Each structure stands twice: as C-alpha cells, then as structure tokens.
C-alpha cells in the first residue's frame, strides 16, 4: 500500500466520525429537553465547529498534503481556512472548560453571569478570533512576496504559512494558552474537590469522636473540652456551608443547649444533648452532609471529565506543533520520519472531532438519549 | 483648582501635541521624495494612529472619567473605542520595530519581502488585530449583565470594561507582548553590532599584522606562512558578507602573491603584498567603507529602539501595573486619585511622542521639519 493512500484512507475516516459523532450530540440536544441548558449550548456550538472541521477542514487539509501547481494567494486561502476551523474547536472547547469552572466554584453567581445572552456572545468571540488568527497571513504575513512557472507554487502548508507564524503566533497563543487555561481550570476544580473533602471528614470525625468521648467520658472536665471542640468544628462547617444555613443556626443552638444542659448537674442531659447532636440523630447534620456530598461526587465527575479533556487535548495538538518548533529553531538538526509527521496531522484532526462526544458519553443523561436514537431512528 | 479641571486641561493639551507633531511627521514624508521608503511608511502609519488618539480617544477617555448617566452599551461603545485606538498605536509602533529588525539583521531579503503591498498588508494586520481585541467586550465580555435609574450606569471605565479583560487579556497581550517583542528587537540589534564589529576588527588586525610582518618579514618561507593566515582571514571576511566582486579579486591577489612567494622571496613577495596595504588596496578600502557605514547606522537605530522601548515602558506600565494591583489585590493600599489619573496621562503621552522622537532621530526628518517652519512663518 502507498504512503499517501493510507494517509487519505485514515484521514477520511476521521472526517466521517467527525460528522457522525457530532450530529448525534446535535440530535440529543434537539430532542431531550433536560439537555438544553446553558452548558450544553456550548457542546452544540463545539459540535457545530467540529462538523465544519469534518465537512470543510479535513478535505482542505488533504488538499494541502498534495502540492499541486496553484497560485499563491489561492493556496493561501485553503491553509487559512483549515486554520480558522481548527481555531474554532480549540476555542469552543475552551468555553466548555471555563463554563464548568463557573458552575462549580462560583455556583451562587452562575445564573446571573452565564445567561443565554453572553453564551451566544462567548461563542461569537471564539469564532471572531478564529477568523482573526486564521486570516492573518492573507493580509500580508505570508510567503510569496517574491517548478510551475511564474505565479504558481507547490501547494503545501509550510510553503504558504510562515513557520514563525506557526511558532511565535499560532502555537504560543491558540494551543499553548488554551491548554494552560484548561490546565489551570482542571487543577483549581480538582483542588477544590480535595479541600472540601478533607475538612468535612475531619469535622465529621471530631463530632463522632467527641460525642463518643462525652458518652463514655465521665468524672472529669473532658466534657467541657469536648463541647468546645464540637462547637469549633460546627462553626468551621458553617463557614464553608451556605436548608443548610437555617439548619446550621439550629445546630449551633443545640450545642448551646448542650452547653446549657452541661451547665448545672444535668450531666445525663449533656450526654443526651451530645446524643441530640450525634450524627445518627440530627436532621441538620444529615442535611449538611448530602449537600457537601452531592457537590463532591458531582464535581469530581466534572473534574475527571476535564482530566480526560486536557489529557486528550495536549496529547493531540502538541506533536504537530512541537515538530513545528524544531523545524524553525533547529533546522540544521534532525527531523522526524515521513510517516511520524503525518500522524501528527492525523492526531490534530482527532481532538477536533472526538472531544464533544467524550464529555457527552461521560454524562448519564446523554448516554440514555444516545441509546434511544440508535434503537429507534437508526434501525 | 480642581483635580478634574486639571485632568481635562492636561488631557486636552496632550490632544494637541498629538495633532501637530504627527501631521508634521506626515508633512515631512509627503514632501521629501527620499523619505518615501517602506520604513517611513510605517512611521507615517504610526503617526496617523497617534493623530486619531488625540482626536477621538482622548475626547472619549475624558467622557469616560465623568461617570455620567448613560446606557451601558453606550458607555461600552465609548470605552471599547478607546481600547481599539490605543491598540493600533502600540501595534503600529510594533510594526516599525519589526521592520527595523528585518532591515538590520536580514538585509539581503528586505526589499524582496517588505514591499509596499505587504506594508499595506502588515499595517492592516495590526488594525484588524485591534478590532478583534478591542471589540471583545462589546461581543459579550462586558459588565452590564447584572444612581441613574435602570439600564444606565455611571459612565466610568471600570463600570463597562471588566478588569479580568484589562489584566488576563488586554495587558497580557497588548502591552506586555508588544513591549517585550520590541525589547528583543533592540536586544538582537544591540548584539548584532558587537559581532559585526569583532570579527572585522579581528580580520583587519590579522591582515594588518601579517602584511606589517611581510613588510619587515625576513627571507625564507616565513613570508609564505604569513600569507596563509591572510588568505584564511580574507575568506572569513568574505563569508560574513559590487562588494563580493572586490573580494574575489582580493583573494585573487593573495593567490597571485602566493605563487611568487613560493619561489623567490626578496623580490616577488614585496610587490603584490605591499599593494595589499590599505593604500594600494582598492578592494580593502571599499570593504572598510561599508562596515563603517553599516555599524554606526544600526547603533543609531539601536539607540533609537532603546528610546522607543524606554518611552513605551515609561507610560503603558503605570496604568496596567495599577490595573493588576486593583485586580489581584483590591483590598490592599491604593494609589491616590491624582497618581492613578497620572497613569492615564502617562499612557496618553507616549501615544503622541513616540513616532516623533524616533522620526526626530532620523536626520532626513530633522531637516524636513525646519523647512516647513520658515515657509509657514
Ligand atoms: C489550531 C491551529 N491549527 C493548525 O495548526 C492546523 O493547521 C495544519 N498544520 C499546522 N501546521 C502544519 C504543518 N507544518 C509543516 C511541517 C509538517 C510537515 C508535514 C507533516 C507534518 C508536519 C514540516 C516539517 C518539516 C519540513 C517542512 C514542514 N504542516 C502541515 C501539512 O499539511 N503537511 C502536509 C504537506 N507537507 C509535506 O509533505 N512536507 C514534506 C515532508 C518531508 N520534508 C521534510 C522534513 C524535514 C525537513 C525537510 N523536509 C518536507 C516536505 N500542516 C500543518 C494542521 O492540519 C493543523 O490542524
Ligand atoms: C490598548 C490599551 N489602552 C488603554 O489601556 C486605554 O484605555 C484607558 N484605560 C485603561 N484602563 C483603564 C482604567 N482602570 C481603572 C483603574 C484606574 C482608575 C482611575 C484612574 C486610573 C486607573 C481603577 C483603579 C481603582 C479602582 C477602579 C478603577 N481606568 C480608566 C479611567 O478612565 N478611569 C477614569 C474614571 N474612573 C474613576 O474615576 N474611578 C474612581 C477612582 C478612585 N476609586 C478607587 C481607587 C481604589 C479603590 C476604590 N476606588 C474608584 C473610582 N481608564 C483606563 C486608558 O485611557 C488607556 O489609555
């Protein structure tokens, strides 16, 4: 088999999975109602760019690996467009990553900040900078101011796109920063799930232990110390908690009634009051947990969701762009074989097509809507 | 006197200093034919943007300080437009600095790359960049999501333009990046002189010595050893650089001096080598004339850049340095009213005196400014 026939056969397959995997998501949003929220409009817009990446961009990238006699400013257009469409995916994916940062770390402000209005404008900002970075060489910064005769060059990417443009401008800004942002967004969401866990479990253990002491502590002032450490832990739990505000005002009250029952000879009532506030028997503690729980198990999901996206985004775009930097800074030294460099192109067009499907299939509601269309409309 | 009455007074004074000095720069380039090159097209293009700053941006950046009752997207439009205008003064100053980087370190490809079509193009890139950045808040990244009633905010800058836009985005990319680039441009040009200076003052001295040897050089083959060093030095000088014609004859004359030196020393070596002394050496004399011309030409374009960078950092730093302090440390100590407003005036001063000082350092500009005065006056 040829070296070009294999590239095109594989490269055209990704274009199919591009359109297929992203219209199914574009199908599940148009059908299921509980998926039409703000977060998933970005998935609609990312899949919309991904379909433009599959329909229009991948054929324009195969066009570039041929190198036929064509005019400069025309062959420049082809390379600018595949740049434009590959800018849109990395930018729309960045919007989903930042949206998850808002609804998870700043939840009491998510409604009045990410409405349907600015979400329609955030995507409009992504596509505007895609056409700004994209159509930059067309306005001068290209490589034909001065084989096929006059006016016609070999239509390859490195021939019409300046390599310093790809090194200094395109990579450093449209792949590096978008990755270092989704990195910092994943990290601060990951770390947020780690701080909420350690303080809840430690507060918890102090409550059960102290109530365990008090119940089994007697003939000493240990009860006074145990109530003090219980009060402090309930307040630390109040600082993080926001139902939960009302219930915490009452837990503080029950510790005071506990301290008022610990005050005058009512040592058994102080033990009863520790039983009032002991986990098993407190309506407010149990309510406090399920909140502090539900957020943990939910945003650890959206943490691993980002861990998979960043782990896939860095994995796909860097090989193509790292090879670029060696060609510009180290052109005397060694290259990569003729097959390994085209794979760096294949991987680039993978992240731009299989990203909206991974985070979709990781959510249980998208996983149930997909099955309802495959069994019904497909068959 | 008022703290606001002096603000608009000082601001309007700067608005005129923009108008005159840069129309003067454009008055000069339109007169002299030899000023109509490609680099001074970037100086006119920059001088044109600084005229717009004093005509539109300064009247807009004052209305922004009043904090008057107006709809948000009306104060946004006044606030995004001042971000589009100051944008193009730093991106056109960047184009001058990039142009001066090419002409100095890569001169054998300057005219074949920086045509009037791509200079018409590069400037368009700088301007299309500004709209793509300045009109980001108008596309959503503003402040009126959720005094004067409903829908109308106190038309201040920080009331319509976010601060994560003016730190995470507008400073990181439109003050820090443009300034650090022109810093590296100055750095690579400043180091270009020391390397073109050394290897020549090396080649020249290696050449002076061996012939000064050859003059008082003894009988025997020691004269032949000295010629071998001169040939290698002449090859090094030919490597680092009409002109290429004079070296092949020079290399030809050293080989002409070589065979004669291989056989009879006393008489054969003296004629050719003595005419390789600067006096009877036409090709060395043409060669030294070029290096003397190029060396102190790029240093006056290196000091011209240390000034362009120094003036640029002296003004666009105090504004965005305070922007970062109010964004990453809003609780801690503030800069007072006048000092924060001074930083606004600073960032507006560079926008009216930056093409000037650079153009005024050009000697062809300096005569064209005095010819305008005597004719007008
Ligand atoms: C969000 C941003 N979006 C993008 O960046 C998108 O733009 C595309 N792209 C981005 N850099 C691209 C890029 N660098 C060029 C790079 C390279 C070339 C080929 C394959 C991978 C990378 C290169 C390396 C070495 C020399 C020149 C360029 N070469 C291409 C693109 O088509 N090559 C297909 C057609 N070329 C070719 O047959 N060359 C042959 C290969 C062998 N000889 C080599 C190797 C070493 C030295 C000299 N000769 C040169 C001729 N495409 C790119 C890509 O599809 C991205 O998705
Ligand atoms: C391509 C780059 N282009 C540019 O950067 C241009 O855009 C303009 N600009 C860029 N950041 C700007 C910027 N930050 C706001 C910053 C500041 C404010 C005033 C003066 C200098 C800097 C600030 C600091 C602290 C608090 C809020 C904002 N404030 C203004 C601009 O007009 N203030 C005039 C109208 N506001 C005001 O009276 N507030 C008062 C100031 C005093 N109280 C303070 C200070 C501390 C704490 C509380 N209260 C707040 C209200 N203008 C800017 C400026 O004209 C630049 O030339």
Decide if A83 contacts A134 (C-beta within 8 A).
yes
- Residue A153 parent element (H or E): strand A152-154
Q: What would the DSSP string read from start to end of A33-82?
A: GGG-SSHHHHHHHHHHHHHHIIIIIHHHHHHHTT--EEEHHHHHHHHHHH
Nearest to B113 among A115, A124, A145 (CB): A145
What is the rounded distance in angstroms from the CA atom of residue A5 to the CA atom of residue A149? Answer: 28
| Three-class secondary structure of residue A278 per DSSP | coil
Residues of chain B found within 8 Å of residue A164, distances taken between Cβ atoms: none
* Number of neighbours of residue A247 by Cβ within 10 angstroms: 19
> Among residues A291, A212, A211, which one has the least CA distance to residue A248?
A291
Q: What would the DSSP string read from start to end of A224-244?
A: HHHHHHHHHHHHHHHHH---H
Q: Tell me, using a 6 A CB cutoff, whether residue A87 lines ligand 1.
A: yes
Distances (CA, A) of A375 to A24, A28, A257, A368, B296: 13, 13, 60, 11, 79
Decide if B17 contacts B47 (C-beta within 8 A).
no
| Three-class secondary structure of residue A152 per DSSP | strand
Test B139 with A129 for CB contact under 8 angstroms: no
> Among residues B3, B62, B44, which one has the least CA distance to residue B348?
B62
Strand partners, A82: none
Helix axes B72-105, B303-328, angle to 10 degrees: 150
Torsion sign, CA atoms B285, B290, B293, B296: negative
Long-range contacts of B366-372 (CB under 8 A, 24+ apart): B368/B27, B368/B28, B368/B31, B368/B32, B368/B35, B369/B24, B369/B28, B371/B31, B372/B24, B372/B27, B372/B28, B372/B31
Resolution value (Å, 1 decimal)? 3.8
Strand partners, A70: A153
- Residue B186 parent element (H or E): helix B176-216
Distances (CA, A) of A47 to A27, A103, A179: 11, 21, 19
Q: Give the determination technique.
A: X-ray
For B155, phi and psi rounded to 5 degrees? Answer: -65, 75
Nearest to A128 among B114, B125, B132 (CB): B132
Q: What region does A30 belong to: left with phi over 0, alpha with psi -120 to 50, or beta?
A: alpha
B328, two tokens? 């990453």
Test B124 with A139 for CB contact under 8 angstroms: yes
What is the rounded distance in angstroms from the CA atom of residue A83 to the CA atom of residue A130? Answer: 8
Strand partners, A296: none
Long-range contacts of A251-257 (CB under 8 A, 24+ apart): A251/A277, A251/A282, A251/A284, A251/A285, A251/A288, A254/A282, A254/A284, A255/A227, A255/A230, A255/A231
Q: Tell me, using a 6 A CB cutoff, whether residue B158 lines ligand 2.
A: yes
Distances (CA, A) of A56 to A18, A93, B328: 11, 19, 43
* Number of neighbours of residue B270 by Cβ within 10 angstroms: 17
Question: Of the residues B67, B83, B136, B158, which should be mutated to test ligand 2's pocket, given the most ligand atoms within 8 Å of the CB?
Answer: B158
Spacing of C-alpha A3 from chain mean position: 36
For B113, phi and psi rounded to 5 degrees? Answer: -135, -35
Decide if A359 contacts A96 (C-beta within 8 A).
yes
Which letter, b or e, does each residue of A282-312 get, where b requires 16 or more Cβ atoms within 10 Å of its Cβ? bebbebbeeebeeebeebbebbebbeebbeb
Q: Tell me, using a 6 A CB cutoff, whether residue B154 lines ligand 2.
A: no
Residue minimizing CA distance to atom 17 of ligand 2: B340
Which residues, including other chains, have CB under 8 Å from residue B42's CB and lie 6 or more apart? B92, B95, B96, B99, B119, B122, B123
SS3 annotation, B10-63: HHHHHHHHHHHHHHHHHHHHHHCCCCCCCHHHHHHHHHHHHHHHHHHHHHHHHH
Which residues, including other chains, have CB under 8 Å from residue B124's CB and lie 6 or more apart? A139, A140
HSE at residue A249, side-chain half, CA atoms within 13 A, is 4
Torsion sign, CA atoms B158, B161, B164, B166: negative
Determine the residue of chain B that is closest to A122 in CA distance: B140
> Among residues A131, A135, A172, A178, which one has the least CA distance to residue B181?
A172
Decide if A361 contacts A367 (C-beta within 8 A).
yes
What are the structural domains of chain A?
3-174+336-378 (1.20.1070.10), 193-291 (1.20.120.10)
Q: Tell me, using a 6 A CB cutoff, whether residue A61 lines ligand 1.
A: yes
Measured in angstroms, how far is the CA atom of residue B163 from the centroid of ligand 2?
10
Decide if B112 contacts A145 (C-beta within 8 A).
yes
Residues of chain A immediately before an interruption (C to N > 2.5 Å): 146, 242
What is the rounded distance in angstroms from the CA atom of residue B301 to the CA atom of residue B362? Answer: 9
Which residues, including other chains, have CB under 8 Å from residue B36's CB and lie 6 or more apart? B29
Q: Tell me, using a 6 A CB cutoff, whether residue A345 lines ligand 1.
A: yes
Q: Tell me, using a 6 A CB cutoff, whether residue A159 lines ligand 1.
A: no
Decide if A139 contacts B125 (C-beta within 8 A).
yes
What is the rounded distance in angstroms from the CA atom of residue B165 to the CA atom of residue B303? Answer: 34
Strand partners, A154: A69
Which residues, including other chains, have CB under 8 Å from residue B56's CB and lie 6 or more apart? B81, B82, B85
A236, two tokens? 């630390």
* Number of neighbours of residue A251 by Cβ within 10 angstroms: 24
Dihedral in degrees, nearest 10, Cα atoms A307, A165, A132, A136: -160
Q: Give the number of whichever ligand sits closest to the CA of residue A85.
A: 1
Q: Give the number of whichever ligand sits closest to the CA of residue B89.
A: 2
For B311, phi and psi rounded to 5 degrees? Answer: -65, -35
What is the rounded distance in angstroms from the CA atom of residue B80 to the CA atom of residue B161? Answer: 8
Q: Where are the alpha helices (DSSP H) in chain A?
A: 3-31, 39-52, 58-64, 72-105, 116-134, 157-160, 163-164, 172-174, 176-216, 222-240, 244-261, 267-277, 283-329, 338-361, 364-373
Q: Give the number of whichever ligand sits closest to the CA of residue A81.
A: 1
Question: Of the residues A326, A341, A352, A355, which should be mutated to test ligand 1's pocket, given the most ligand atoms within 8 Å of the CB?
Answer: A341
What is the rounded distance in angstroms from the CA atom of residue B70 to the CA atom of residue A305? Answer: 43
Distances (CA, A) of A358 to A5, A181, A306, A310, A361: 29, 19, 10, 12, 5
Which residues, including other chains, have CB under 8 Å from residue A131's CB and lie 6 or more apart? A84
Q: Give the number of whichever ligand sits closest to the CA of residue A163.
A: 1
Which letter, b or e, does each residue of A152-175 get, where b requires 16 or more Cβ atoms within 10 Å of its Cβ? ebebebebbbbbebbbeebbeebb
Spell out which chain B residues touch chain A, with contact meaning CB-CB distance below 8 angstroms: 112-115, 117-122, 124-125, 128-129, 132, 135-136, 139-141, 145-146, 173
- Tell me which of A45, A125, A138 to substitute to probe the interface with B (most B C-beta atoms closer than 10 Å): A125
What is the rounded distance in angstroms from the CA atom of residue A187 to the CA atom of residue A199? Answer: 19
Residues of chain B immediately before an interruption (C to N > 2.5 Å): 146, 241
What is the rounded distance in angstroms from the CA atom of residue B314 to the CA atom of residue B308? Answer: 10
Q: Tell me, using a 6 A CB cutoff, whether residue B64 lines ligand 2.
A: yes
Decide if B210 contacts B230 (C-beta within 8 A).
yes
- Residue B71 parent element (H or E): strand B68-71
Residue minimizing CA distance to atom 29 of ligand 1: A157
CA distance B67 to chain A (A): 24
What is the rounded distance in angstroms from the CA atom of residue B199 to the CA atom of residue B45? Answer: 37
Measured in angstroms, how far is the CA atom of residue A331 from the centroid of ligand 1?
14
What is the rounded distance in angstroms from the CA atom of residue B160 to the CA atom of residue B75? Answer: 7
Q: What region does B217 belong to: left with phi over 0, alpha with psi -120 to 50, or beta?
A: beta
Decide if A275 contacts A269 (C-beta within 8 A).
no
- Residue B239 parent element (H or E): helix B222-239
CA distance A124 to chain B (A): 7
HSE at residue A288, side-chain half, CA atoms within 13 A, is 28
A97, two tokens? 């990553």
> Among residues A105, A132, A124, which one has the least CA distance to residue A41?
A124
What is the rounded distance in angstroms from the CA atom of residue B226 to the CA atom of residue B223? Answer: 5
Rg value, chain B, Cα: 29
Decide if A81 contacts A57 (C-beta within 8 A).
yes
What is the rounded distance in angstroms from the CA atom of residue A103 to the CA atom of residue A303? Answer: 12
Which residues, including other chains, have CB under 8 Å from residue B338's CB and lie 6 or more apart? B3
Test B121 with A140 for CB contact under 8 angstroms: yes
For A152, phi and psi rounded to 5 degrees? Answer: -120, 125
SS3 annotation, B91-136: HHHHHHHHHHHHHHHCHHHCCCCCCHHHHHHHHHHHHHHHHHHHCC
- Residue B365 parent element (H or E): helix B363-376
Distances (CA, A) of B349 to A103, B25, B49, B303: 43, 17, 14, 20
Decide if A155 contacts A67 (C-beta within 8 A).
yes
What is the rounded distance in angstroms from the CA atom of residue A119 to the CA atom of residue A103? Answer: 13
Distances (CA, A) of A148 to A60, A69, A158, A176: 21, 6, 17, 37
Question: Of the residues A10, A176, A314, A345, which should be mutated to test ligand 1's pocket, given the most ligand atoms within 8 Å of the CB?
Answer: A345
Decide if A66 contacts A372 (C-beta within 8 A).
no
Test B129 with A132 for CB contact under 8 angstroms: yes
Q: Tell me, using a 6 A CB cutoff, whether residue A170 lines ligand 1.
A: yes
């Amino acid at each position: 088999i040829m070296g070009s026939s294999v590239y095109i056969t594989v490269e055209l397959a990704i274009a199919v999975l591009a359109i297929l995997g992203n219209v199914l998501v574009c199908w599940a949003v148009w059908l299921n109602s509980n998926l039409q929220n703000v977060t998933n409009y970005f998935v609609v817009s990312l899949a919309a760019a991904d379909i433009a990446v599959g329909v229009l961009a991948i054929p324009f990238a195969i066009t570039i690996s041929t190198g036929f006699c064509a005019a400069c400013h025309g062959c420049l257009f082809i390379a600018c467009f595949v740049l434009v469409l590959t800018q849109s995916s990395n930018f729309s994916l960045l919007a989903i990553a930042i949206d998850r940062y808002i609804a998870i770390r700043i939840p009491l402000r998510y409604n009045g900040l990410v409405t349907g209005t600015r979400a329609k404008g955030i995507i409009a900002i992504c596509w505007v900078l895609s056409f700004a970075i994209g159509l930059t060489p067309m306005l001068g910064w290209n490589n034909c101011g001065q084989g096929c005769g006059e006016g016609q060059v070999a239509c390859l990417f490195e021939d019409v796109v300046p390599m310093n443009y790809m090194v200094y401008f395109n990579f450093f800004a449209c792949v590096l920063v978008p990755l270092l942002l989704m990195l910092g967004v994943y990290l601060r969401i990951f770390l947020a799930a780690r701080r909420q866990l350690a303080d809840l479990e430690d507060n918890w253990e102090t409550l059960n232990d102290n109530l365990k002491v008090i119940e089994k502590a007697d003939n000493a002032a240990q009860v006074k110390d145990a109530l003090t450490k219980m009060r402090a832990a309930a307040l630390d739990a109040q600082k993080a908690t926001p139902d939960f505000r009302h219930g915490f005002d009452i837990l503080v009250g029950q510790i005071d009634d506990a301290l008022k029952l610990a005050n005058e000879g009512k040592v058994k009532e102080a033990q009863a009051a520790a039983e009032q506030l002991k986990t098993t028997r407190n309506a407010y503690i149990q309510k406090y947990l399920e909140r502090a729980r539900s957020t943990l198990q939910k945003e650890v999901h959206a943490a691993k969701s980002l861990a998979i996206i960043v782990g896939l985004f860095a994995l796909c775009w860097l090989p193509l762009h790292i090879i670029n930097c060696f060609t510009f800074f180290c052109p005397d030294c060694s290259h990569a074989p003729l097959w390994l460099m085209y794979l760096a192109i294949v991987l680039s067009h993978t992240n731009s097509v299989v990203n909206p499907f991974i985070y979709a299939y990781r959510i249980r509601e998208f996983r149930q809507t997909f099955r309802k269309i495959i069994r019904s409309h497909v068959l």
